[PDB]
């Protein structure tokens, strides 16, 4: 059976805290943006010739414009302010555990925000060869998990150290693995 989708995204883009804000009102139909309002532009602009008659109608109403203009303030900075309290300033620090699959895994889990820095070390030396990461995975519930295998078949008496850094713990977390 045939499907039809109307779709609207209202975007608030924040640079340097809320120094620079930019606002996008985007109208789609079936994966096709036909008209948007860009706070950086001032008026409604048509994206495909399907939305050209719409955006000409909408910029005629000068009341509409003035109003949409100030969403960067009324809408954007406003919502930021409200929620910064528990989104921006949200830090949950990682849960790190090292173990070899049956070659060495470093499993950081349940952390926020995204940006994270994992490094493998061999005997106090930074390994840069065998680093094979699964990259930053989204858990979907305001937590992230990532894994970083190290490609080493080792020798007895060596110490491997996984070194996590994150904006929720100042001095780095470090886990150990003796061969």
């Amino acid at each position: 059976r045939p499907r039809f989708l109307e779709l609207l995204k209202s975007e608030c883009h924040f640079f340097n805290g809320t120094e620079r804000v930019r606002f996008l009102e985007r109208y789609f139909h079936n994966q096709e943006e036909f008209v948007r309002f860009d706070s950086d532009v001032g008026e409604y602009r048509a994206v495909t010739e399907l939305g050209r008659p719409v955006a000409e109608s909408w910029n005629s109403q000068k009341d509409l414009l003035e109003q949409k203009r100030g969403q960067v303030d009324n809408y954007c900075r406003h919502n930021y302010g409200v929620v910064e309290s528990f989104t921006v300033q949200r830090r949950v620090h990682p849960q790190v555990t090292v173990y070899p699959a049956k070659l060495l895994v470093c499993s950081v889990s349940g952390f926020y925000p995204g940006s994270i820095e994992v490094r493998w070390f061999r005997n106090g030396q930074e390994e840069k060869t065998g680093v094979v990461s699964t990259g930053l995975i989204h858990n979907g519930d305001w937590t992230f998990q990532t894994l970083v295998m190290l490609e080493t078949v080792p020798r007895s008496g060596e110490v491997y150290t996984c070194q996590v850094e994150h904006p929720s713990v100042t001095s780095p977390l470090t886990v150990e693995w003796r061969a």
Binding site: R1, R3, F4, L5, E6, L7, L8, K9, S10, E11, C12, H13, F14, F15, N16, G17, C76, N79, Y80, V83, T87, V88
Partner: peptide, 24 residues
């Protein structure tokens, strides 16, 4: 860039189901 807050909504016919949500 630093942060992106999006208010994404939609209405699908003929199922007649809608959704409204905020993405941080």
């Amino acid at each position: 860039e630093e942060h992106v807050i999006i208010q994404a909504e939609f209405y699908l016919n003929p199922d007649q189901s809608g959704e409204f949500m905020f993405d941080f």
